[PDB]
């Protein structure tokens, strides 16, 4: 009988990932539009 | 809405103007300090006819 796997695993680091969110979408529309800046929050289209 | 005038800057500017008006009023009229309350007896004159 030798050292076990769980007992040996008590001395090991796990690789932890950042939390995964399944509702993330590629959001293509935001990538496809052209964005113009509005200096003070008002945009008049003549 | 901070272009071309900063909104916080103007808000604080008008606040400080009102506060300094109140400060002058208290320099004249406060009950703790204030010129009209800290005038010694004998330093108070009265008009003779009412008009200055």
UniProtKB/Swiss-Prot annotation, chain A:
What is this protein's record name?
Type 2A encapsulin shell protein SrpI
Q: What is known of its domains?
A: Has 4 domains; an N-terminal arm not found in the type 1 subfamily, a discontinuous peripheral domain (P), an elongated loop (E) and the discontinuous axial domain (A).
The UniProt gene name for this protein comes to enc
Per its record, what triggers expression of this gene product?
A: Transcriptionally induced in the absence of sulfur, requires CysR for transcription. Part of the srpG-srpH-srpI operon. Present in when grown in sulfur-containing media, induced 7-fold after 48 hours of sulfur starvation (at protein level).
**Superkingdom of the source?**
Bacteria
Which cysteine residues pair off into disulfide bonds? none
Where in or outside the cell it occurs: the entry states: Encapsulin nanocompartment
Query: What stretch of the complete protein does the chain hold?
Result: 8 to 53 of 306
Indicate the quaternary assembly. The 24.5 nm encapsulin nanocompartment is formed by 60 subunits; monomers form pentamers which assemble to form shells. There are 12 positively charged pores where the pentamers meet with a minimal pore diameter of 3.7 Angstroms as well 3-fold axis channels and dimer channels.
Similarity-based family? Belongs to the encapsulin family. Family 2A subfamily.
Transmembrane segments in this chain: where? none
What is reported when this gene is inactivated? No growth phenotype of a single sprI or double srpI-cyd deletion mutant in the presence or absence of sulfur.
This chain's function reads: Shell component of a type 2A encapsulin nanocompartment. Expression in E.coli generates nanocompartments with an average diameter of 25 nm. They can be disassembled by treatment with 6M guanidine hydrochloride and reassembled with cargo. The nanocompartment is probably involved in sulfur metabolism. Probably allows passage of cysteine into its interior; during growth in light the physiological pH is 8-8.4, about 30-54% of free cysteine (charge -1) would be able to pass through the shell.
